[PDB]
Design a binder for this molecule. Sequence first.
Ligand SMILES: O=C(O)c1cc(C(=O)O)c2c(n1)C(=O)C(=O)c1cc(C(=O)O)[nH]c1-2
Ligand SMILES: [Ca+2]
Lengths: 573, 71
Amino acid sequence: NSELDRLSKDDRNWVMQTKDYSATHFSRLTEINSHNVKNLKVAWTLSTGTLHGHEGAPLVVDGIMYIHTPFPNNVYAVDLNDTRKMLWQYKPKQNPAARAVACCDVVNRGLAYVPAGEHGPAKIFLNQLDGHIVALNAKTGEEIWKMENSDIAMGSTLTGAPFVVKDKVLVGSAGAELGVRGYVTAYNIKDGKQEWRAYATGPDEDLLLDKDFNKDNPHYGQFGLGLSTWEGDAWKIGGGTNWGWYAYDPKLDMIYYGSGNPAPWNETMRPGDNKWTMTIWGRDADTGRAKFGYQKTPHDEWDYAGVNYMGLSEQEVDGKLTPLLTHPDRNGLVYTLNRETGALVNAFKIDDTVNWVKKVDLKTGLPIRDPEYSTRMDHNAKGICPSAMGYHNQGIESYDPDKKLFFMGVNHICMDWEPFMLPYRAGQFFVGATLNMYPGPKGMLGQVKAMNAVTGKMEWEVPEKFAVWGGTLATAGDLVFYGTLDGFIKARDTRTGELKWQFQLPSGVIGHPITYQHNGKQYIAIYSGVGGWPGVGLVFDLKDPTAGLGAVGAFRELAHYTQMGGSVFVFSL
Amino acid sequence: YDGTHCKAPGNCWEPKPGYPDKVAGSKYDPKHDPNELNKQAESIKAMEARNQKRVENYAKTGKFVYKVEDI
Ligand SMILES: O=C(O)c1cc(C(=O)O)c2c(n1)C(=O)C(=O)c1cc(C(=O)O)[nH]c1-2
Ligand SMILES: [Ca+2]
């Protein structure tokens, strides 16, 4: 959408969760900078009225801030000239049975926005946990249309944010832990008419492939693989849901996202590469036809769900300025691809302790597996890095284009894993593995790291007590901001990683910070309200360390530091 | 099974030593019910059909109505 793209370049706005179509999460605002961030104070605050995990962040457009919640996914608008009053509210009526099919809390990664045009007035879009996509008037809150995307009776929910491109809103999927076969859907923003739907497994017509799919990298695989890398009909319940983030290059007219893990977690029940789960896609925006598809983790054994964000940049590769995507995967590798051809430029370990893979052969594009760290029936595999929670999860990260550095909150969590046989029954959990998780060999659960994605060179690395889950915001004031699971917001100098500021929020953070200028002054905002996968133990009062898909034991100390909460904090000088 | 021995482009899967080339008939046979396997796809057809009704109604009347029984 060209007007959305233009609105994204104004520092008064934060028009999409990713900030802009390249997912830079980078602000040119410098009022707040490394030399005065120590003076940053709370300006004002709002309550969301709900508990549970608060993922994503507010949107800001045309002087209105929009806020969203976890289930039942209430939405509120706030005029920035009257921050105490709610301009409008929308309160969904959803079946509370939706909660029972969420694998890891009832998080919602947030709203999207389109400006007014021929389609009608400006709209806010909401994915509800119960599987509806809803279009709301951005200025009044009126419900304009509502369609059914996902069916909770099949274990199929929505958690990822909608994504606006041209006259379409993209809606993902969720429920691989319940054998949902993943699909992404484009809806026309005027009337909610389904325009195209692309599945992550199965026959080629369902995958929605360009006639020239992977023509530049035929060794990635081309046709028939959605069937031939499964045994029989196992692809029908095969996972590949896309609950994470997207990027878009308007010059190429291409949308980028990752498909999730194959189902069930029990690898021995689904022999084959299990294409096209765990795949970085480049799809034509108008038709949904894939031009490239690179499978990062063939025959997943670890739940390395391939849904993490896609950060676009232009950088020199062997002296030539090239359009790139960079993607820190759950599997602990940071991929950089040419975003026109799909060619692999680099794939390096985010932390050297990653051990399921020895390395990625960049010519063949294949990860060379270490059998000592495989999973398989009749075996309790120990000491696998990363755990299923990944060395990187749902946080949207940041890119300083002057430094050519990505700043990422990283997890340092390892696991044991033992599968078990189980039947598929629609609407029930279909996991099939028992996990225990614990810190990785360096001893702490999180890090923050700055790196060059082309060279793999780490500029700096700092430890964090807990996994850094919510992603980051970088600015031309030489700062990267992020929240922590133990309930701080923090700012570090992006040349060195030195800690410059921190503030104790009420609850742990699992979304990202935003910044915007309103009436000549720079503000930073963030959600506080812990939950999500790390917080499942405290959210649901679990004590078995293997519960919460293995998260409960790793995060058992988190409840000493944070309770649940739900607020929006806004800072300024 | 190192992942590097490819039967065809994009197909490098091999059984791990001691495990079977195919699971049907093995002790790891998932034994899925074909009728269960088809339920998600039938649910998506029903949702697609309801959504199409809501779209047709909007085009007919100019007013959005969600509940298909009220159209
Ligand atoms: O594969 C499934 O579709 C699915 C859904 C979700 C979700 O919808 O939040 C998560 C996951 N998987 C998952 O593997 C995971 O590591 C995870 C973390 C979180 C979270 O927000 O804290 N959600 C999810
Ligand atoms: Ca998953």
